[PDB]
Design a protein around this ligand. Structure first.
Ligand SMILES: [Mn+2]
Ligand SMILES: [Mn+2]
Lengths: 191, 191
């Protein structure tokens, strides 16, 4: 199979200033393209030749896993954002967040803290199990909740390339701004 | 024990375009300052409290190690560069490199590759053991050779903050460009 560089569901400048047009150009256009290209090369001659991305992330290791995990993480990351959105979650997800974290505000506080305290490169993930129980997962480097059987709902990329051009070392400030571009309709759909 | 922010032996714009003025300001002025302040705040209460940098690094763990290792990594990193240096190593080191890697060009190729293939944040290190044996070590996140009892000679920081402002995703190009600002006279002295 040939894994693809996903086409974005919005214009490249649609998430500015939180994820600037320049950041989308390098993050999506260069980093993700590299992950996809490396993944396509590394799976040739392995048991993942004809596997779907999800299967490769659940089973692979080493370099293959690093590129697979990164491809999946970015695919979910870019597709969960939209301009003119943000706001608070609703429906079952909104109620699940309220019941399990107390309030949306408290949830954001814990999520931001998990993202800020993750040392080095990685991802902070909001994930659910088969019963709807939510958890905040800290995933170093290429980690993804799917490697644990969990459902990936919302992720903040804390690899420095996700925010350095606009925020430099201010990771916390970037995380606080990400909430403004989250499309909760999309996250809710994953739940 | 409570350390400080080392002084740069050159002007902040002296390494352009390899390490830009803004990068030095953020890398040295913000990132390293934070590692230093965090280290000072963490010595209190433990055993490594009162211990010189090298010892803290080889003896500490968790957050204390994370900040001591990064402080030591950066101190060695910033001081090994100089505008107008570069070139090739001489003396015992230059000979050790040819004998152990074949040639300086080959060593650089190996070094560059180790840096480019280190997944996530980290450091590529040229280290020496007690018998003078040289090795290229990939140190993820805050790793440093001093932790294995080795002599840290030369390091390229591959945390993205070290190059993103100028090179964005082009890590490989950044590593190729770093050779022009390495002060082999300083590296030799550590060997
Ligand atoms: Mn990313
Ligand atoms: Mn650094």
């Amino acid at each position: 199979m040939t894994h693809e560089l996903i086409s974005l569901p919005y214009a490249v400048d649609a998430l500015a200033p939180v994820i600037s047009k320049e950041t989308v150009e390098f993050h999506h256009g260069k980093h993700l393209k590299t992950y996809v290209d490396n993944l396509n090369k590394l799976i040739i001659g392995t048991e993942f030749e004809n596997a779907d991305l999800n299967t490769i992330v659940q089973k692979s290791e080493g370099g293959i896993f690093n590129n697979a995990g990164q491809t999946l993480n970015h695919n979910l990351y870019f597709t969960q954002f939209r301009p003119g959105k943000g706001g608070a979650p609703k429906g079952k997800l909104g109620e699940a967040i309220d019941k399990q974290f107390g309030s949306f505000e408290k949830f954001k506080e814990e999520f931001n803290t998990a993202g800020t305290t993750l040392f080095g490169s990685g991802w902070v993930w909001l994930a659910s199990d088969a019963n709807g129980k939510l958890s905040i997962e800290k995933e170093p480097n290429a980690g993804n909740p799917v490697r644990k059987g969990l459902n990936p709902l919302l992720t903040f990329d804390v690899w420095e390339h996700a925010y350095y051009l606009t925020y430099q070392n201010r990771r916390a400030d970037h995380l606080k701004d990400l909430w403004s571009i989250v499309d909760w309709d999309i996250v809710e759909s994953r739940y």
